[PDB]
Design a protein around this ligand. Structure first.
Ligand SMILES: N[C@@H](CCC(=O)O)C(=O)O
Ligand SMILES: N[C@@H](CCC(=O)O)C(=O)O
Lengths: 258, 259
């Protein structure tokens, strides 16, 4: 039958076209992840439908109830066959879903307003005038929640107890908060997105050099999926043929403005 | 009567058109700095000739002889009326020529082959398997020669004594050397040029995060010349109306080829 692909509205992975109200089906969407889905579906020879995760979340596990939300929940509870998104491979998610080999590399990173005196997480941790936060339900929050490294536990400790909340619900809200804070808010986010925002107008944010960690995005499928193997191979082939590099160039750097 | 403009072939500031062999005079050339000259000559109303500096160099002073070469020398000894090129504003050059206000900002940067394990200039300084070098007679060489920062001084000492020479005569030679070295050569160059090349075919180069310094390009004229003020006056006006930003966009990002 047709494969249900869950994914998430996160520029430049998946974005709405300007005139999407005049378009239908998978043609409503464009982006790196839309192009990757097209290629994987070609190399695996299946038909697919792109769907946007209804809760708009990546995926995390509720501690009290052990239930998954976001794209992970869609796979675990059978609402979708495959997730194609900037979805971070992590040990905890690996317990309930299967990931392909990485199609992209990234690390947690810092975004500041051009001008802000910050060069590192250690600078952030040792001061208080500049507030910092993360997206409210992703691998970046969890990295800090679970870190045993002193700088990062201190940062998590400050972030969990800050009033008002330093967490945001969307990358766009975090970026907006950086722009509006006169250099008084730094946004902790993945380097691929930090890089994308850096080269878009109004060109007032900067990505601090040096990531806090190093990891990858994978295509995810449910445990037991017959699709699991074909998608892994599709990822490796497209990396061999250089297509992953071309799409990254296509969506990040071709369209720069700074 | 005609204003002689000295400049240098550096993509995307100044380039030969694909069909330059069918053209003559100022029509052989294209690029950011070509457009800027055409516009500056409009707002000041003079006719000009574009010339490519004969020694192909930006400009340096011989220690023993105190004589300048390159585009700086063309201005100091009266072979040209004005230089319009990615010519870096520096204190030692200001002793002998007049610079406009910056028309563009940049920093020293690092170019590697996609794959190379280098994350910073400090990383370069601490190892031996990967060679690095600069253009042989410009501000980037002098920045390193003169730096009181330990890493950059460690880098100059390695570069000057390295065998074979890690220095190159043209930006293109430095870029070619990166591609041909399987990640065994890193090229230290200015950020505007590194960024343009990164998104040009064959798309096998990368710019390390973080510039090593911050400085600007200026239009140069000879010391005392009346054309200096007339041309600076043109520089700032056209930025206010976005002319500089339009040319920056027109020549840099429009022209990607790696997606
Ligand atoms: N890529 C992350 C979302 C972004 C973030 O957590 O900063 C995830 O899969 O949870
Ligand atoms: N703009 C430099 C040339 C480029 C470089 O040294 O990297 C100069 O004015 O000498």
């Amino acid at each position: 039958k047709t494969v249900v692909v869950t994914t998430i509205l996160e520029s430049p992975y998946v974005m709405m076209k300007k005139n999407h109200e005049m378009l239908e089906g998978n043609e409503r969407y464009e982006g790196y992840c839309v192009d990757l889905a097209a290629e994987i579906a070609k190399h695996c020879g299946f038909k697919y439908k792109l769907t946007i995760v209804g809760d708009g979340k990546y995926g995390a596990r509720d501690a009290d109830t052990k239930i998954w939300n976001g794209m992970v929940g869609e796979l675990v509870y059978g609402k979708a066959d495959i997730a194609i998104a900037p979805l971070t491979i992590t040990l905890v998610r690996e317990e309930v879903i299967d990931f392909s080999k990485p199609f992209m590399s990234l690390g947690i990173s810092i975004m500041i307003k051009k001008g802000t005196p910050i060069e590192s997480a250690e600078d952030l941790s040792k001061q208080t005038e500049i507030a910092y936060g993360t997206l409210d339900s992703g691998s970046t929050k969890e990295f800090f929640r679970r870190s045993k490294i002193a700088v990062f536990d201190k940062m998590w400790t400050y972030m969990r107890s800050a009033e008002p909340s330093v967490f945001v619900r969307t990358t766009a809200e975090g970026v907006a908060r950086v722009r509006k804070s006169k250099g008084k808010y730094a946004y902790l986010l993945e380097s691929t997105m930090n890089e994308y925002i850096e080269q878009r107008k109004p060109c007032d944010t900067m990505k601090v050099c040096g990531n806090l960690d190093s990891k990858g995005y994978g295509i995810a499928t449910p445990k037991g999926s017959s699709l699991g193997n074909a998608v892994n191979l599709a990822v490796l082939k497209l990396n061999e043929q250089g297509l992953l590099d071309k799409l990254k160039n296509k969506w990040w750097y071709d369209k720069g403005e700074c």
